[PDB]
Symmetry: D2
Subunit: 247 residues, 4 copies
């Protein structure tokens, strides 16, 4: 149908090897987007090419390196046309209580989780603004809004992405580009599977819904914001957290 139909759109999904990023890339492809998913390695890129088949391809991308960004965007533009949907999903953690947090743990998080968003967003915006049509969707975290002990760095970067997102939204709204954040709660991934039974129970205790989210549930929220139907949503943070926090 014509409902939430992404046929004709080119989507770049960073960090698409697994979990949330993979669910996003698959669902955008299922709704008809041409999808380029990225990984930090060539092997990862191949795994992405494998799951996307004819609906797109995987590319190696170093989100902290300007030259890589330019090379990947050039390859995309040449084959598929300019990027219509950017999903910034790449991100890491470097957890530690503040008194134990190293300078490098702080600066790696800023680089990978916040500065990357500045760089990639800037790199795709010009084309979107010329077409007067675009979507930038940041995959954030409930931690950016709630805060979390032991994650002051991750929380800082995720909250920073929201301030960036609002400002960019204001800059580009009149030219038909929307900029939003999807903020997952506790989602079932490799990270949550690596927890103790006691830590899993503690996580679930914070969730009124009484379960972890599925990566598909994050993908659905992203696909929604990516759609023509979400044109009047901008500068928004869509929380998908099972009631863990309510704004």
């Amino acid at each position: 149908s014509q409902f939430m139909n992404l046929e004709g759109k080119v989507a770049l999904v960073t960090g698409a090897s697994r979990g949330i990023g993979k669910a996003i890339a698959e669902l955008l492809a299922e709704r008809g987007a041409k999808v380029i998913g990225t990984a930090t390695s060539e092997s990862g890129a191949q795994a992405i090419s494998d799951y996307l088949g004819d609906n797109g391809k995987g590319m190696a991308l170093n989100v902290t390196n300007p030259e890589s960004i330019e090379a990947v965007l050039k390859a995309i533009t040449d084959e598929f046309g300019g990027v219509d949907i950017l999903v910034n999903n790449a991100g890491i953690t470097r957890d530690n209580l503040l008194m134990r947090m190293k300078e490098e743990e702080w600066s790696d998080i800023m680089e990978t989780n916040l500065t990357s968003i500045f760089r990639l967003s800037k790199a795709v915006l010009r084309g979107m603004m010329k077409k007067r049509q675009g979507r930038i969707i940041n995959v954030g975290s409930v931690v950016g809004t709630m805060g979390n002990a032991g994650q002051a760095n991750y929380a800082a970067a995720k909250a920073g992405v929201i301030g960036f997102t609002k400002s960019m939204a204001r800059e580009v709204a009149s030219r038909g580009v929307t900029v939003n954040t999807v903020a997952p709660g506790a989602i079932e991934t490799d990270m949550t599977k690596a927890l103790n039974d006691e830590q899993r129970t503690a996580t679930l205790a914070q969730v009124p819904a009484g379960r972890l989210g599925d990566p598909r549930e994050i993908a659905s929220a992203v696909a929604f914001l990516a759609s023509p139907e979400a044109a009047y949503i901008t500068g928004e943070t869509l929380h998908v957290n099972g009631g863990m926090y309510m704004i």
Copy 2:
């Protein structure tokens, strides 16, 4: 497809004669819901029956009267089965600066815009909680979050609906019911069409997107939250306002 598919769901949409409510009811039917839309009069009810055809029907409902609520729900349950999706869209305005605002203008807004949501929500929840599956979606307003001079009553009631929504979300999350609000900005309707040129220009000036929203844009957000795919979204307020306010 199986994406955002409401086949098998019974949806009650209050205030569905026109504009936003009508767009909601049509889209839910398009996605396969059986839809009961309401109006305050029988002729309105018939207009709704006319546009829904085989996908549902219209009923007369006084959202401030307990007996009417019980009669409408009984008729729905008997023919279609219990309500799976409640969209609380019925709502009025009674604008005035506070020094000019009559007791009755305050109380009518409370009754129609806030207490109605308590009554209807309570009336459908028991069945939802037994099935361990349900959606309650309130159509709010940016005015609930931003405030607006001359609409202290409307703002109070819409903000009140958010407090209710968050509490109810916490009560019923573990039993598979979600409760959320969609908060429209300035949407093109009969009300906005009744404005003079200067007032329309003033409204547009508050919108980064540089246009009014379409009722279909509110409907899309409602359909999204109504879907199986939005199961992990609860106690949330989804803003659809073209950047008029950014939370």
Copy 3:
């Protein structure tokens, strides 16, 4: 000193017999305000007169009855001059899960916790707007922002007060009146003292600060917003909750 000095201001504090309301009234008097505190009974009114001594007096007030409001304001205006600071602290709870919540438990909360604020605010505003100087301060609750199972009514009314506050703030800002809410978390009062050990431990577990708040802590926040120094704070909700929720 001239810092946070309320000499020359007339303050009406509703619900001032004990706990938070009493702490507010005492502190405003300490900072030099002339304070009228209210209770629902004459004996309560006398208790207030007793603790205020020469710094003010107690009056019986039914915050749900127009005639009582007019009588109390007339008596205040005649003796002290018009109200400069209104603190809306009067408020009740009628807790129940929604399926158990009676019509009257809903409506009593609306009446006492939300509609009262409309009535009193409206009744003092005209004088404030003529002087181009005023403070309206609502004592809310963290429950208005967070929601709470079993308190959907109380949450609705407190959230409603915030929507009202923001709209009124916008109406009256240019005429030198501020309108704000102080939102207490779990504060040590008779209510919290009536809890068993297990319920107190459960409350404390939700508070990063690891203790209940003191009523004096709410009073200090109210005194701050009441001061000349807070003239540029309006439409704000000041959370005093030990980290129980972070906006």
Copy 4:
């Protein structure tokens, strides 16, 4: 009096040469704090020493340099005792629409406005946590919450400080340290005085209060949060913006 009395507290106020920072340092001294204000130059440090007289002193501090931080904190601890109140007020702007924003304009803002807060906060926290008593107060901006076109970098850093603040609040709440942000709106400073008449009118048009804030109004909000009376406020953002934004 004993109300909002900072006697016995050592306060470090970064960026205290003028405007907001100067008003903060003066008011903390007026409430009895021993105040160390910082500037980036020795001459600035002397200007601060001059205005603080016997109530404190000025020190040169490079907030982007670890060695300087350690030297300044050692000098403070040796003479005054460990820092009880940190106010992070130092900050710059590097404005540009995203398509014009240089890598260095992005990275200078991150360094000076966000990473500095990580470094200085970390450097004073240990002592505060041992005493089980402390205040960290970040001077943010309405731009961090609202976003602003042409300031995506500044907005990112200020919003980031809020995510950091919430996380740190959660880490240290049980040890009697509070962490908060004061978020000024449009305040009268050298920056606002450098604007066109047309830009000043445009700024005022966004402010319901109809005027710019005074730096003293920001100082008062900071002094409040710094006080013993604000012990139950943590992880909060106190907006002081004349109604320019309402959360």
